[PDB]
Structures are given as C-alpha cells and as structure tokens.
Design a protein around this ligand. Structure first.
Ligand SMILES: C[C@@H](NC(=O)[C@H](Cc1ccc(O)cc1)NC(=O)OCc1ccccc1)C(=O)O
Ligand SMILES: C[C@@H](NC(=O)[C@H](Cc1ccc(O)cc1)NC(=O)OCc1ccccc1)C(=O)O
Ligand SMILES: C[C@@H](NC(=O)[C@H](Cc1ccc(O)cc1)NC(=O)OCc1ccccc1)C(=O)O
Ligand SMILES: C[C@@H](NC(=O)[C@H](Cc1ccc(O)cc1)NC(=O)OCc1ccccc1)C(=O)O
Ligand SMILES: C[C@@H](NC(=O)[C@H](Cc1ccc(O)cc1)NC(=O)OCc1ccccc1)C(=O)O
Ligand SMILES: C[C@@H](NC(=O)[C@H](Cc1ccc(O)cc1)NC(=O)OCc1ccccc1)C(=O)O
Lengths: 230, 202, 230, 230, 230, 230, 230, 202
C-alpha cells in the first residue's frame, strides 16, 4: 500500500501524505544533534561534534555558519545540500541589505529560504532538500530563534533542537529550561541537554558554542572557554 | 545602367547594356544584367550590384522549387507578386534595386517592381539612369503591331540612344526573345552586331 | 526493498538514503589509489600507477593535473568524468583571477567544483559524476588539502587518500603520520602508506609524486628522483 | 539483477557500472579491425577491408578519413554515428585554425571530440555514440597517436588497434613491435598483425594504408603499393 | 530477452544492437521494389508499379521524384515519411545553389539527408524514418548512384536495389550486370532483374523508367517507350 | 505480442508497423460514409446524412466545407479534430493567395495539410489526427480529387470514398463508374453507390451534394434538388 | 483490455476510442441538469438548483453566466474547470469586439472555446476539461443555441439539455417541444421537462430562468416570477 | 594600397605592394596583402586590415573544409559567390574591404568583389587607392596574347607606376603565378628585383 505512493514527490497518498517529504526528514535524523535557546537579551547555538580521526582539520566540520555579523545558522542532514542552502541564505541577506540598506526582520530571511525548500516539494524532476536549519540572531525586534524543515515549515522557539538526539534534547529542555537566564547559566544548561541525549557508551566532546547579545556582534567560543563548561 | 522590356502579340523582348560603375569609375565593361529565371521568364536588374545578384539567386531557387512541386511554371504575375512581398517585408532596410520581370504563361507580360515592392504591369518599361532616353524613343516609335524582328531593332535603337547621353551606360547590348514556341532565346552577339551595322549605329 | 528505491537519483529511500549517489561512490573505489599529505611549509600528492602494456605512452596516464602554477588535483573513478571536472576547475580558477586579479583561497575553488557535482544529484535526467578529487596547493592562508566526493561533500585534511586502497592507506596514516615533517621524510612515509595497501602478489611501481612549498611553484618529481625512494 | 540497471544511460548499477556505455562498446566490436602505429619521424594507419559484392564502388567504404592535411582518423562501429563524429572533428579543427591561425596540439582536437561523446553518457533522452576512433597526425610536438571510446576516454599509444580483432592485433603488437622502424618495415609489421587476427577460413585482402612524415602531408597508399606488401 | 531492449530508440541491447532502427528497416521491405544502375556516361532508375484499381490516377503513384533537373530520387517504405524526406532534399539542393551558385557533388546532398535521418535515431521522443532512398544524377564528377537507409548509412553503387524484392534483384545483378552498357541494353537488363524478383503468379506491369546522360537533363520514359521493353 | 508495441506513437513493431497510426484509422471507419467523383469538366462530393432527433438544426451537421470559392472538403472520423484540420486548410489557402496572388495547384494545399498530419505521427507527446479528408476543386490544371488519411498519405482519384461504408462504395464504383459523365448522371450514380452501402434495415436519407464546373464557383444542392435524385 | 488503453490522453484504443475523453464525459453527468430552448424571436435557459444548507448564499451557485449583454452560458461538470472556461469565453468575446467593433456570429465564439477544449485532448501532460457548456444568445442572424462537450464537439439545437438528467429531458422534449411558442408557454414547457427528469422522492425547487428577445438584452427571472411557473 | 590580377591563356597573375598606413603615417613597410586560399586560388585584400585578415582566415577554413568533404577544389566562381553572400548578409554593418579572387578550375578566372557583395568577372582588375594608375597602364599595354613572362613584367610596371603617384602605396612588390601544371607559385624576391633592374625601374 505505502510502496505504491512513495515513489514520486508530486503524488498524494490516499490518506493525504507526501512520503517523499517524510523520507527526506529521515535523512535529517542521521545528522549530529544541534540546539539553540534564547536568554536574557541574547540567543545562543550549540552543535555537537563527533570527533573523527586526527587527520581531519578542526576548522571545516564546524556546523555553525554566520549568515552575517548578526545572524547565524546551524544545519543537520545532507552536508552537500546544507552548504547550498547556507550559500542561498547569505546571498538573500545581502539582497535585503542592498534593497533597503539594512536587515530589519530575520523572519523574512527564513521565509525566503523556506520558500526555496517548499518549491522543491511541488514540482516533478527534483528532490527535496534533506536538511533542517536553525536560524538565530538579533534584529530590530530582538533575539530571534527559528527552525526550518525539508517541507519548508517555519516555527519560532524559545528553545529547540535538530538532529538525531532531537527528541531527547527537547524533552530535557521541556523540563529544565528557564527564561531570561544569564549567558553562562544558559550554556551550562545547554551542555546538560546535549549530554542527556548521548548513549551510555560515549561522552560529551567539547562542542561548538556561539552566542550574540543586543548591541553586539556574534562571537564564537574558543576551545579554552568550551572546556570550562565541559 | 539601361534596361528595357517590351511586349508584342506573342513575344517578350528584354535588353540591357553591360557597363558597371564600381568606386566612381568604369571598372567593368562586360557586366551581366539580364538573366533567365525560368523556362519562359526573364529578369533585368538595376541598382546595387550586391543586392541585385542575391535576388536573382533567390528567384531562381524559388521558381525551380515551385516548378518541381506544382509540376507547372509559376505564372508571370505570381512571380511579380512574390517579389513584391519580399521587397516590401524589408522596406525600411530595403534592397536598393529596380527590377523588370517578363515572360509568357498564356500571354505576354512585363512587370516593373520598385524597391518598396510596388508592382505594375505595362506594355513596355525601362529602368536605370538611361531609362528616360529610352522612353522618348519608345513613345515616338513603339507599335503594338510590330513583328519580332522590328521589335529587336526598336530596343537596340532605344538603348543606343541612351548610351549616347547617359555616362553610366555603355558596352555591348544583350537581347533576349521569349516565345511559347521557342522558349527563352538569347540572341548571339554577332547577330546583334549585324543589326547595329544595318541600322547605321556604328 | 532496496531495489525499489535505487533507480532514480531524485528518490529518497524510506530510511532517507540516496542509493544512486551511493552507487556512484562504488565507481570511485574501482580507481587507482592516490593520497596527499601536508608537511612543513608544503603539501604533496602521490598517485599509484598500474603499469599497462609497453604500447602506452607514459605521459597521458598521469592522474596528477595542475589547475594552475600553485594548485594541483588528483582524481579517481570514471576517467572521462574526471577530465570534465578538471577542465571545469581550470576554467573556474581563471575566472577568479580575471575578477579579482589573483586567487586568495583554494577552498572557494573547491566549493565551485563541489556545487557543480551537487547539482547533478538533485535534478532528474542527469547522473552524478562518479569521481572523487583531491585538491592541494598554496594560497594566501598556507598549504591546503581538500577532497571532494560524488555527492559534493567537502572536507579538509592534514592527510587523506582516495581510490581502491583508501581504507588501507588512511589506516596506515592514522598510525604513522607526523606533522611538520621534512619533504624527503614525507615522501618516504607516503611511499610506505601506498606500499601497505597493495596485495601480496604485486609491488610498488614508481608512482607519481608532486609537491609545492611556500613561495615556490609546483614541481613534478622526475623518474630519477622517484626511484630514489622506491 | 543486471537487467534492472541496464535500461537507462543515467543509472548506476549497485557495483558502480554504466551498462548502457558498456553495451555501446559491444557495437564497436562488430566493426572491421583497424590499427595504427608510430615509426621513425612518422605515424601510419591500417584499416582492414571486407570485400563485398562487385556492385559497390571502391571509394566510399574507405574508413580512413582526413581531418586536415596533417591529421587523419579511422573509426569502427556504427557507420552513421562515425560519419557524424568525423564531420564534428573537421569543423572543430577549422575552428582552431580560425582562432589561432594554426593547429598546435592534436590532443586538444581529440579532447573536443571526446567531450562531445562524454556528454551523451550523462544526460537522459540521448544514447551514446557507438563508435571508437583513432587519431594520428603531425603537430608542433611530433607524431601523435590517440584513441577514443564511446565513454569518451582518451589514451595515447605507440601502437594500438580497434575493431573485432583488436585483442589479437594488440597481443601480436605486444610481442613484435619495435620503435623507430623505417616506414616500409612498419607497414610489413602492420600487415602481419592484421593477418594474425583473421580466422583460418579467410585471408588478407589489400587493406587501406595511410602514413605521414615530419615536414610532409598525409599520403594515401595506392592499390599498386598495397599489393607489394600483400 | 529481445523484448526488453526493443521499446526505446536510445537503448542499446546487451549485444550492441538498436532494435528500433532494425524494426524501421522492416517497414522498408514492405515497399515496392526499385533499382538503379549506371551505364555508359549515364545512370537510370527503375521502379516497379503495383497496379491498383482503375479509380486511381496514374500520375501520383510515381515513386521517381526529381530533386532538380540533374538529380532524381526513388524511395521505398512509409509513403508519408518518404514525401517529407523528398521535400527536405529539394530544399537542401536549392540551399546549395543559393550559397555557391551551382551543385558540384551529389554526395554532399545525400549526406545532408542522411544526417537528418541519423538525428532521429539518437534522441528520445522521436521515431526513425521508415524510408530507404536511392539518389542518382550527374554532377561535376560524373554519373553517381547512392542509397540511404533508415539508420542514415550511405553507400555508393554501380547498381543497387531497394524494396521487397531487393535480395532477388541484387542477386540477379550480381550475375548479369555489365559496365558501360548502352542505355537501351541497360534498360532491358533492368527489366529482367525486376522480372526475376516477382512471384510465379504475377508478371511485370510496365514500370517507371528514368535516365540521364552527361550534358543533358533527366528524361522520363513515356508509356509507349516502356511497352517496347515490356 | 501486439499489446507490447501499440502504446506509443514513436515505437515500431518487430514487423515494422505503427499500431497507433493504425488505431487512428479505426476511428475514421466510425464516421459517416462520404464520396466524391469527377465528371465532364467538373467534380462533385456526396456525404451521407444520419438523421438525428428533430431538435438538431439542419445547418451545422453539414460535413461538406468550402475551403474557398473553388475548393471544397469533406471529412470523416473525430468531428473535433476534423474542425481543426478544416480551419488549418482555410488558413493555408489564404496564405497561398497572399504570397502569389492566386491558387494554382490544389495538390500543394493538400500536401500542407498532410504534412501537418504526418508531423503528429513522428513526435512523442502528441496523438495523430483521427480524420480522413477528401479535397475536390478546380485549379489551373482542371478538376482535382484527393484524399488524405491519418498517416498523412496522399492519393489522387477519379472517384473515391471514406467512412464506414467505404469498402462497399468503392466496390460499387469499381464496377459502374464511367468517365466524362454529365453532372446529372454522375449524381444519380453516386446516389446508387451510397445506397448500395447501407444495411437492409435503413434507406437513403437525402444526403449532401455539392459540385463545381470549370469557369464557375462551387454550388450547394438545395433540398428540393436532392429529392429529385432521391 | 480496456484498462491497457485508458491511462493516457494521447493513446488510441485498438477500436479507435479515446477513453480519457470518454471518462471526462462521466464527470459531466455528475452535474446538475440544465437545458435551453428557442422560442418565437428568442431563446431561454433553465438550470436546476439543488438546495443545500441555509448557510450558503443564494447568489454564487448560479450556473447561468452572462458572457455579455446578449450572450449567456450554462455549464455542467467540474465547477472549477467551468469557471475557467467561462472566463476564457468572456475574454474571447471582448477580443472580438475590439477587433471588429461588435459581435456578429455567436458560433465563432463557441468555436474558440471548443478549440481550447480540443487542444487539451491531443497533447500529453494535460487533462481534458470535464465540462459541458450551452451557449444561447442573439446575434446578427437571430436566436442561437449551441452546446459543447469535453471533446470540443459543437452542435446547434432548437432545444437541448446537459447534466445528469439529460437523457430524460431530451426524451421529454422529443415528444412535447413546439416551435415559435410564446415565452410564457416555453418556460412552462421547460419546467415540465425538468420536472419529468427527477426521481419520485424529490420535487422541483424553483430553478434559474433566463431569456432574451430580439432587440433587447438578457433578463434574469426573479424568484417571484419563478414561483409563478412552479 | 595597390593590388592587381590579370588572366592569360592558361595562367593567372596577381600582385600587390606592401605599405600599411596605420594612425595616419607609414607604420609598416612589409605588410602582407596576397594570400593563397586554395590549391589553385589566390586572393588580394584592400581596405581595413582587421576586416580583411578575418575574411582571409574564413575563406581558408571554408575552402579546406569544402575540399575535404566533396573531394575536389571549389570552383572559382563558387568561391566568389560564397564571398558575395557573406558580405551582402551584413551590408548595413559591412566589411570595409575590396577583394580580388583569381584561380584556375578549368580556365583562368579573376573576380572583383565589393563591400556590398557585388561580384563581377573580368579579364583584369585592380583595387586600392593606386588602382586608377594601374588601369591606365593596363588599358594601353595589356594583350590577351601575352606570355607568362610578359605578363609578370606588365604587372610590375603597372604597380611601379602606381607607387610613383599614390602616397598610400609603396614597398616591395609580391607576385604570384597560378597554373594548372605548377599550381600556386609565389615568385622569389630576388627574381622580382632582377626584373625591376632589367625594366629600368630603379
Ligand atoms: C554532518 C551532518 N551529517 C552527515 O554527515 C550526513 C548524514 C547523512 C548520511 C546519509 C544520508 O542518506 C543522510 C544523511 N552525511 C552526508 O551528507 O554524507 C553522506 C551522504 C550519503 C548519501 C548521499 C549523500 C551524502 C550532520 O551531522 O548534520
Ligand atoms: C584511471 C582511473 N580508473 C579507471 O580506469 C576507470 C575505473 C572504472 C571502471 C568502470 C567503472 O564502472 C567505474 C570506474 N575506468 C574508466 O573510467 O573506464 C571504464 C568505464 C567503464 C564504464 C563506463 C565508462 C568507463 C583511476 O585509476 O582513478
Ligand atoms: C563499417 C563499420 N561497421 C559496420 O558496418 C556496422 C557494424 C554494426 C552493425 C550493427 C550494430 O548494432 C553495430 C555495429 N554496421 C552499421 O553501422 O550498420 C548496421 C546498423 C545496425 C543497427 C543500427 C544501425 C546500423 C566498421 O567496420 O567499423
Ligand atoms: C508505396 C510504398 N509503400 C507503401 O504503400 C507503404 C508500405 C508500408 C505499409 C505499412 C507499414 O507499416 C510500412 C510500410 N504503405 C504506407 O506507407 O501506408 C501504410 C501505412 C501503415 C502504417 C502507418 C502508416 C502508413 C512503396 O512501395 O515503397
Ligand atoms: C460526424 C462524424 N463522426 C462522429 O460523429 C464521430 C465518430 C467517432 C466516435 C468515436 C470515436 O472514438 C471515433 C469516431 N464522433 C465524434 O467525433 O464524437 C465522439 C467522440 C468519441 C471519443 C472522443 C471524441 C469524440 C462522421 O460521420 O464523420
Ligand atoms: C455544480 C456542478 N457540479 C458539481 O458540484 C461537481 C460535480 C462533480 C463531482 C466530482 C467529479 O469528479 C465530477 C463532477 N463537483 C465539483 O466540481 O466538485 C467536486 C470535485 C471532485 C473532484 C475533483 C474536483 C472537484 C453542476 O451541477 O454542474
């Protein structure tokens, strides 16, 4: 039954489902866990790192990407598709700055990215992007936190997560998250949430941390500062 | 340049001279201005040499393809109409030519076509810088009852007069006679010279 | 099950896999083994040679190709697709030089090549390139070493390998690689890594060696120098 | 298994094979055997002739075609596809002469032809050319000898062969080929190689022979000269 | 086996065959037999006529078509496709005359027609022409005789045939054809060849005969002259 | 067997048949019978009428359509496709008059219509017209009578028929047709031919009759004149 | 058998049928019954109304649409496709008025609509309109009444009907229709015809009535006048 | 610029000078204006250097491809017709050149082609700013019965006269002789100098 309605993107199932979009969401769950949360006059992003062999440079596997000095993004899923979407977001942000002289709402930037992803779910001959993204930054309204799925759906969160351990992290944040926390406390809480999603075999491995506050630009935590919360 | 075409009872006679003025001097004395484009159709050209030669090649291709597809020769008025459409479609970037088309389908016909695609049928016509001198000769001497031999002498005298007064015209005279019985026949050069000597034009 | 989701490039499997991309990676493993590693103020490339009959000229089977005087590439997989990608890289490098007057970052050149390969995995009517590439050179940042797969993924390495004996070489380099080695020592280590990947029947056959140092252009090792490490 | 991955050109097999390209190579092996070899300051081509009925003119079945006064080609496989590729090569050669005033490297001409053939193996809605070609000539580097397959692969040889008896000829040349031979000796060796590939039933039938030397143009052997080596 | 590789034009069989092209050749063998042969300073064409009911005008079923005053063609197979190809040949001939002022080689005209037919065997969404053609005429080289198949292959003959009785006619001409025969003798020989291809039930029925000699235009034999050889 | 080669227009059968074209001819045989014949200095058309309910106006079911004052056409098969082809013929006739000032050969007009129909049998994504047409008129050659089939084939007749009772009418005309008959006699003969094609149950029902003579325009028989031959 | 030739619009059945067009006609029979008839110097339209819940406004379910002040149309089948066709007809009518200054023949307007519908039955990638339409109005010839089907066929009637109860209404009108009736009598007859098509369970429910006379514009019957014939 | 081409019984002789005037002064003294474009065909160029050089490359490519496909050399009149079409197709954005084409197919031919695509065959022709001086020499001294040696001396004298009166012409004279027996042969510079000394032109 299901195998008869899961071969083409533009085919609805008898119960009104799009299995090709659903299958793309399975690719997202294979990616590394990442999360973001808002705090007092700021927002931060944490991305888990799976340490590979020592032959890999520790500068290209960074999943946190700056869209500009005030907007950052983190992705999960197909790396190649994620790189294309990040490049599209950067071009879209600059187009906004050329047209109006500045960027006023981050939600508009997310919508342009999501509209691009939604287009690849309605026309034949293409496949949907197998990537989920989280956008966080500061605009003329304040700290913002958004997520985007392969289907192109947009939601705004006080705290959210993507990746393989998404369910474990969101459950942990459902119990222990507090609003308007200081930046240091928020990072400690985020480390515990990422810690509570791994298996018993492994342990936390000094992830990527980035944050921004109102009136300032994005700053990337160095390895020395990360070890302090480790 | 001097071209002329006349109609008789059962014949069409067309004639031109041969002088070509390229770069403001007489560079060529034996240019070709009279062409056979179908079994019973001829055409003369005046104006820009490049434009005229391209049109001659186009008409030969169109008429030959027409004959092969529809198994009959294109009527003379249809030939003029086809040329009329081609020239008018590019009237603002036009061929700088003056054309005469003559032939036999069921009766003699001569058509004059200008650069803008206007086509007018007439009993006789002349094109080129020497045409007004030809019209003077034809107005005073042309007769619809003339024989073919008399018609050939008439066009020779008319072109000879034009060569005496138009510096852009000169050279040997080429004459073609079109009839249903004999088709398109270009008169030999020696025969033209004999007629010139008999008429006292040399 | 798998045979129902492995016929079209733009079809996701129920577990979120792209089998056509995976099958392209199988073509890569049929190619000859090649590797590259960085050393003290430089980077080198080594490509194994399988000696065919004597009727073949020993100048066209060279898998190391110069993108410019400061960037070189080596490929593995379908030769015909590899030639097209190398030509695309050379044109892309010159476009960078015309626009800005020079080449500043090699990673940008790799991204343009990878974006071309990623495009051939999302649109119907085309097949992915069955080629893996390694890019090495000197730019305004220093020695660089990149790899690219049929899916269009980009990673930066201190040392890496491609081809049939990729697993054996990377395991050997995982145990014996050292940083900032002299050029002569690095070549000797690379020969041993390539040696430790062949079967017992055959033996090493004087491969291709190329290297470059900061402030200089790429130089190709001649057969006389190769025999010295053989 | 194989029948499920051999219907479309743009489909990889589970083991990373392109069966449609492979099937095109089968059409090549149905063609008549042809070979070429380099000698002292020159290169020659020999193409076997299968004598048909006497009603066929002995001027159109010539498989050796001149690309220009200094480059010649011989093909094997689908005659109709071979004619198209030869016409493409001739146009490409003239484009090179218009752009630069002369032809410097024959390898560049072969690459343009091979790129055309490679394109017909990656896009749907078209089929690959079922033709293999051998290019031989004199350029600013010296005598050159190339081959091209339906996949678009390029190799340079001192001696090579194509067609049905390719395996027998290359084996014979693997044992008896010598470098820098005189032109007369090279033709005699080539006749023996073509002779050693036929079946016991038939015999050699005065094939096509063409050759060129440095400083001269291509010359086509007449029937009188061919009988002298017969 | 065969039924799995005979549905699409752009699909090769495992043994390197194009069955759709082969199937088009079957349509050709359903057409009426026609033949042509060269004689002393000339060439002629003979096309068998199958007399239908008296209600059909005896002027449109003529299979011999004039391309110009010096080139004629005869076709066999699908009548509708044959009409399109003849129109294409006539347009191509006039394009040659406009560009150069005359027609020098008939073989060039045949190649343009064959290239059109070859194109319809390599691209999807179209079917090949089911027509075989014979071109005969006089050019600046002399009498010429060519044939063309649905695949687009070109061959030059002293005598050849197409249609249902092609095998019988070519076998008869293989035994009795002579070169440089007078025009009257050549027509008598051609009638016997066409006669020797019919079944015992029927008999020859006053076919179409056309011929041309050097320095003259094509002339079509009238019914009175045909009866003289009947 | 047949069901494997009758789904696509651009697919040849193993015996060189185009079943989609053949199936279109089946739609033609469902139409009402119509016929035309030439007489002394003229040509006429007769189209059978199947009387439907009285609610239908007796002015739109007329199958005889005037292309111009001197050319008329009658169709059989799919009414909707027939209307499109008649409109195409009318536009084509006017294009001829604009280009040359008049219409010289009716056969040229039929060829343009047939070329349009032939095009819809060679390209995928379209279906052939299921219409057969008969063209009759006066041109610079004399009375003309043509027919056209879905495949685009053209034949010229002294008398012919289309529709369901085509076989019965052509058999009757094969026995009783005479040339150069007077117009009144020709109409009487045509009525008998149409009468001899119906079943025993029904009877002739005052059909459509149109005719034209040299030097005059087409005239449509009124009901009063039709009853005189009824 | 039938299931093998009913999946694509551009596929003929072995018996020359287009099942996709036939299936579109099934959608028409699901619509509400509507009818139109001509009377003395006029023509009217009646459309049955199926009363839904009271929450629906009684102004948008009107199936009678004015093309202009003198032409009206009523549709049956897919509502969404019907709206598109009505909009196309309105645009087509205005194009006629811009080109010529007025509308002379309504039949020309119907043909443009039918040509649009016929186009969607011959090209792949689209589906036919599942709508039948009736056009009635006054032009320079007089009262006109036309119908159009999904196949694009055009017929002119003195009285006709479309919808689910089409067969019952046409049978009733076949027995009781009279020509040149007064407007009041014609409406009463039309109500009885619509009444004689419903089932025993339900009853007539005050339908839509519109009419026009020569020299006047279309007028829509109000509910008060409809109840008088109820 | 001075170019000339003449026809004899079985030969064609073409000759040019070498002066190139770039930026209103004599920048180049040894320009090339005579080219071999086929086995038995040559061409001379006058006018804009850039346009002329592009056309020479086009003609070499077209004629070589023509020879390889149709196995024979293109006829001389066909060469002129091809050039005529190319120039006329861009007549409103034209090549600002004057061209001479000469060669042997079955008989000697010389064609003159203008910027608008007009092509006229003639027994002899001359192009460039020095052409009127050449025509004066040819009118008084050319003979159809001249030998090849006499023809070579004739073109040398004609160009020498042009160099004495046209400031845009100068430099060494290049001469080519085309025959069926010997093909396209460019005369050596020393032989030209010997003829100049023998004729007393230095
Ligand atoms: C780095 C990134 N993940 C990754 O490393 C992803 C995980 C993944 C693998 C296979 C899939 O089919 C889907 C997703 N790997 C990935 O994108 O490369 C593997 C790949 C497999 C098939 C087609 C193309 C590429 C993350 O942690 O978000
Ligand atoms: C030189 C290069 N390898 C090679 O020589 C590759 C290896 C290969 C063969 C078949 C495959 O399907 C895939 C890869 N051969 C290759 O590209 O040519 C064989 C080929 C097979 C099928 C389609 C097109 C070409 C290397 O060593 O990297
Ligand atoms: C002259 C040339 N060979 C030939 O004569 C080739 C050999 C061949 C036949 C059938 C095939 O499927 C493939 C190759 N014949 C060929 O190209 O014509 C036969 C043909 C068959 C099917 C489709 C199109 C054409 C050679 O000797 O190289
Ligand atoms: C006149 C011409 N032959 C003919 O009359 C050909 C013979 C033929 C029939 C059916 C086929 O499938 C193929 C070929 N008939 C023909 O072209 O018309 C029949 C036809 C059948 C199917 C599709 C389109 C047309 C000849 O003698 O060459
Ligand atoms: C008036 C005209 N015939 C007709 O009335 C034709 C006969 C026919 C019906 C169904 C078919 O599949 C094919 C042909 N009917 C017709 O064209 O309308 C029915 C139709 C059926 C399926 C698709 C489109 C339309 C005639 O007598 O020629
Ligand atoms: C108002 C109009 N009819 C209607 O209300 C039509 C009747 C119909 C339903 C389903 C079908 O598949 C076809 C026709 N309904 C309708 O167009 O909407 C239902 C629908 C169903 C499937 C696809 C799109 C729309 C009428 O009375 O003419």
């Amino acid at each position: 039954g299901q195998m008869a309605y899961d071969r083409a993107i533009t085919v609805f199932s008898p119960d009104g489902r799009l299995f090709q979009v659903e299958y793309a969401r399975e690719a997202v769950k294979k990616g590394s866990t990442a999360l973001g949360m808002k705090f007092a006059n700021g927002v931060l992003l944490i991305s888990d790192k799976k340490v590979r062999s020592r032959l890999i440079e520790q500068n290209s596997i960074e999943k946190i990407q700056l869209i500009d000095d005030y907007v950052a993004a983190v992705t999960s899923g197909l790396v190649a598709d994620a790189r294309v979407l990040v490049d599209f977001a950067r071009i879209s942000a600059q187009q906004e700055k050329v047209t109006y002289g500045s960027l006023v709402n981050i939600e508009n930037l997310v919508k342009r990215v999501a509209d691009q992803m939604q287009q690849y779910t309605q026309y034949g001959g293409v496949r949907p992007y197998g990537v989920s993204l989280i956008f966080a930054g500061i605009d003329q309204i304040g700290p913002r936190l958004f997520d985007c799925d392969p289907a192109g759906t947009i939601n705004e969160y006080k705290a959210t997560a993507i990746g393989s351990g998404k369910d474990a992290v969101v459950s942990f944040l459902e119990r222990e998250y507090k609003e308007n926390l200081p930046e240091k406390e928020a990072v400690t809480l985020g480390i515990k949430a990422l810690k509570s999603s791994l298996e018993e075999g492994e342990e936390l491995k000094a992830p990527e941390i980035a944050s921004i506050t109102v009136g300032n630009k994005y700053r990337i935590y160095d390895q020395e500062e990360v070890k302090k919360f480790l | 340049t001097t071209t002329v075409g006349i109609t008789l009872k059962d014949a069409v006679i067309m004639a031109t001279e041969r002088r070509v003025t390229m770069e403001n001097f007489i560079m060529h004395k034996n240019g070709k201005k009279l062409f056979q484009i179908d079994t019973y159709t001829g055409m003369t050209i005046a104006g820009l040499v490049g434009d005229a030669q391209v049109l001659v090649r186009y008409m030969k291709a169109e008429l030959e393809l027409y004959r092969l597809q529809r198994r009959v020769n294109m009527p003379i008025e249809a030939v003029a109409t086809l040329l009329s459409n081609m020239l008018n479609q590019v009237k603002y970037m036009p061929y700088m030519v003056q054309l005469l088309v003559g032939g036999i389908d069921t009766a003699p016909h001569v058509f004059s076509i200008d650069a803008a695609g206007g086509s007018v049928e007439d009993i006789y016509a002349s094109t080129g810088s020497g045409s007004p001198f030809v019209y003077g000769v034809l107005e005073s001497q042309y007769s619809e009852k003339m024989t073919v031999d008399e018609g050939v002498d008439l066009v020779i005298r008319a072109i000879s007069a034009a060569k005496q007064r138009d510096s852009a015209s000169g050279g040997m005279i080429d004459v073609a006679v079109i009839t249903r019985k004999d088709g398109y026949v270009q008169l030999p050069t020696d025969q033209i010279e004999s007629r010139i000597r008999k008429l006292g034009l040399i």
